[model samples]
Target: NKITPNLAEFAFSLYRQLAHQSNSTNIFFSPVSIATAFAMLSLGTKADTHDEILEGLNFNLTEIPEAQIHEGFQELLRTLNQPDSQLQLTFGNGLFLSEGLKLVDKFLEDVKKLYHSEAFTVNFGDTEEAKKQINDYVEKGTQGKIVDLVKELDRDTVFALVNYIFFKGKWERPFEVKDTEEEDFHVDQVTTVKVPMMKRLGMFNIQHCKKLSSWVLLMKYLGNATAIFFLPDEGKLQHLENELTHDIITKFLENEDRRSASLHLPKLSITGTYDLKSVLGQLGITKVFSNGADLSGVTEEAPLKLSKAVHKAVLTIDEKFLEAIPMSIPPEVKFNKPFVFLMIEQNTKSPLFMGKVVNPTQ
Candidate 1:
């Protein structure tokens, strides 16, 4: 219920579009992060622009009060950013403003508290310095996982919102580090390539999706995050992806059975990015990106629509050893082919990262 479905449904819709367009390479993006930034921006909008922003996020502004949306986001962020967590997890938002621009009190107050943002005043005239400072700030905020974020800052850029999340979580059932070997991964029906695949034999919780002809593997990470790996039976990537839904995921996790498995997952480190303006526009979010956008609630300093909306994330899955001993051989669940996966915050169920790994080498 509530905006949870709003974000999840929007995420799958955006994923389908992205997957359809990007057929060959790896697919990865932070749907939750994009939604977070948009929700923050929506708070600054007025009139129909406000409704449009909320609508684009799959929110019926008439039905859901603006404050409740903000409160939900506040609770969501606070849950994800647990200070005592035993992982390198962080969720950060910031406003980079040009020198001497007065922020509207109402918008500033809400953003500072709800988004937990850090405010900065930069001299956009010094383009190179401002870009480095912003990038460096992002790198530090994400613990160096994301660097060189702001490549070229717009000359007229007044206020830029920066958001990022970083997680370096190890698996609870870690693959034996000694079992890493070079193996072939089928990139597609016509292609196969070699990669460093890690092996593990353990009791895993997996669900059989009879309708999808696929098996959904729920792999736990070290802390409050988990990864959902979807392995479609020979050439069902498109079918399973097209049928992706919150209901299916709910059932998939709910119907899990503990069984022994010989799992082989590729040792992977991949980064993904998206230019969200065009995608958001296709979903009827045009006004916020156009010149006639009504963002007067943010500040009357100057006319501003969203100048840039980009999201980038990195995911690393390798053989990180723990003291847990390996078990005997069992039926194999080899990820030596294309698959769809999700990295999510377990408590809030926020999709921190979602990706389709078509080719490990790519």
Candidate 2:
């Protein structure tokens, strides 16, 4: 059995749209793994979908259950939503080949209804298909910058493609390009790398505390719900992680004061893709794809278990010098120490964004 094309396409498109709406300092996606996880959750909701093959395999949602899967997914979303949290979604496009196009289409329709997107575009074909179809769709939708979405499709393996796309407009007041300089970036305490760093002086949410090793600088986006987190040094990372409890995150968003301070951000772009079967399994969500899984929701009597799950992700950071900068930049201030920044949602205390600038001048 395979996943229908409609479901495959819908999973990818929905993940991309969600990533786009999540606008954060750092963004990423893991379509394959997420799809698998979702399928498991969906199956748990409807058990008869996988009944035919149940005797030979361990298909039981009762172990992890549908409610647990939903909770786990929410928790995963919450983790990704952390101020410094990057984004990721995983799924199995391979199911498309087994399930056919109709299934994929129906899934896409349901997702569109769930997200309430203004408009969306999709392209379906073999690997040799021209880039024009996808490129045209992205260019038209994003008004141009997003280009070359589909790289290559696997010919041998029946393919189900998944993609994660993200776009973020910086704070009204961007850092001045002239202030940018080469600086040392410490990937870790033992290894230091040099890169270009963007600098700015503005009224940002800055704080100094003994609770964490580095200074914390939180930048609020236009909507009060989101803010960016920049952890400047490695020594402070563990401290920040240890201090980052549910309450800490809540208070930081609610009461942290915004003040005039200097900021040095990094100019960087990085993309990474990986398989997340192991990651999800580590998170205690093992029932969906494994034999012990129970996904009866897909069909009334069939006991369907997830066959596969895959995920990929990417992240990029670039600072632009604005001519018509917002009138929020403050005068010069001393920033002799390292700091961290977290992008968070104001009301729910969700940290939907996260990043750290070890050394902007690196």
Candidate 3:
């Protein structure tokens, strides 16, 4: 309970940062993927380098014991990768090291036990081959959803850490392809574009929030996951974005009741890639990327500092309806404009994937 909520806090804060960095470009990324990568790396860091990473990820070391933090992640990861899960959700972590460097024994053991991470030995001096090797590993891990993820590499770099999350789910009540129609999606006041708007009339968890001036709709997947979509009123996106918090999201999920209505959402495929060095730097975590980094815990022989940290996530949503509803009159909700979304695991309420759709065609 403690770890997952704190992770949710990190997700919202990170979304605000990405929102400010880009004005209208589509926003998408996996919060747990990035947080898990850094948490694993912290096992090999010492002193300020270690503390800065954890605090930046929203974990308060003062209140929660350090051992409990890692243990919490272990349990979370285990629960997500259950053998019987109906969702094809996978979390992969990798540590690519230069061929000759030797890592500390305990650091390697802890990461394997806690993160299920696999270590690879590659020669960074051979940049092209190194890139190919890392790319191949990620491609297989994500079932080819992501390819050529590592476009380039630094030959001088001896250590590269990566995290990728791939998710596939079928809508519990999907939108039929025959029902899709060409409709207008308002990008802004003066701009609008045609999109294949999917239509469905059924029971959905929908609510109108007076505080946010936006309509909230919760859609369920086949298994234990559900996605929450928020469509803010015209020109009220900024207000909702600024005011969104973990508590607000929780209130909507816990208190909102299901209603039968007509729903329209565009078929969406979006991906988000980030450079953690710069993003974390802006978030007040810089020691790991600086000359003063204390990575002796990783290796004693070679002077080491983190060279590169990259994170990529992909999400796709399609219509699949398992039940049919009677043709009756009801309120209609359309997500035709810019809106925010969160894909969460129901048991833990941890956000698996979160993003905003500005233009479905994009």
Candidate 4:
């Protein structure tokens, strides 16, 4: 907790900013994956350039030593490799460089040592083939959860850093397949769509928030992981959005208790992509994306800088279940409305995916 506050804080801030900025559209992102790449990239930076990355990472250099920051991420890289865990998860990093553009060996060594990242040489001149390879690599790395991560490369691109994370959780107490039925979901008071919604009655902690004007539920998955759902009142989404904060939901959960309850969740699946250059700039991380960038650690070859930052993800919940509880008893609460959700690793509370579901059918 002490070593990685900045990482978690930045991720939650990004989640809030993403949700706040997008309005009614659905949003999902892996802050862990995003930070891992940039943290590796930071190894090549110096002076003000490095400071900007740390600041963007929500770290205060005066307080935490650079070695501690790197060491924390190094610990994080190893944590994601738990194959025996219930959730199917993996994080991978890569350095896709233009062929014959050599990197300073020390930089490569530190990246490999710290991030466990692999280095790949791509002929950026062959734009189509290079794009295909990078996309294929992402697809393979994520078990096809995310595809076409890189569609094109900048011709000036000497190299690009890539981080890939894949996560799939099997519900320990999954919704019953037989109890699922078509139901009307209120996207807004004036809008409704009929879609398949999962019905389950199990142990969960549900709370109502005055600030969000919403009902919140902490739902469990198999491997000591959790998903939180925030169902806002009709026409109160804007109100609820305004009141959201990093520790707001934490307050709701940290003090709460769990009990048997009925839950109605959409048979939801969503995929989204965002060009994060402008967003990162909004967060005041401008140096790397600008000409003043000092990626001296990556190479002493040609002038190279970050030209693009893309994030793509897919979130799904379908028929996957264990033993679905009886819905004939009726739902204690129905999430037949637009809501926000977050999926996180239970012990660390590290967010894996976060999003708003406006329309499940969409």
On TM-score, the candidate that comes out on top is 3
Give the local distance difference test score of model 2: 0.42
> Residue 42 deviation, candidate 3, in Å?
0.6
The better candidate by lDDT, 2 or 4, is: 4
Predictions ranked by TM-score, top down? 3, 1, 4, 2
Off by over 4 Å in 2: 1-97, 100-112, 115-163, 188-191, 223-225, 230-234, 299-304, 320-341, 346-349, 354-362
lDDT of 1 by residue, 153-196 (tens): 66776656666666567887677778999999997677789999
TM per prediction: 0.91, 0.56, 0.95, 0.89
What are the runs in model 3 whose C-alpha is more than 4 Å off? Answer: 321-328
**lDDT by residue for model 4 (1-362), tens:** 44445766777677677876756677777777777777778888887888888788788889988888888777766666655656665557667777877688988888777787887888877777877887888789878777888766766665665565555566655677999999998876787889998887775677777878988888677676778888887778667766766678557648557656777877877876766666667777778877778878876856667765666666667657233444455437888877877776666666667778777777
RMSD per prediction, one decimal? 2.7, 10.6, 1.8, 3.0
Please count the clashing residue pairs in each candidate, in the order shown: 0, 77, 2, 1
Estimate, for each residue in 223-322, the C-alpha lDDT of model 2 and write its tens digit.
4444445353445554654454444555555665666656666666433333333343443445554645553333234443444344333334556332
- What is the TM-score (0 to 1) of candidate 4? 0.89
Clash count in backbone of candidate 2: 77
Model 1 lDDT-worst window of ten: 320-329
Q: Which stretches of candidate 1 lie over 4 Å from their true place?
A: 321-329
Better lDDT candidate (1, 3): 3
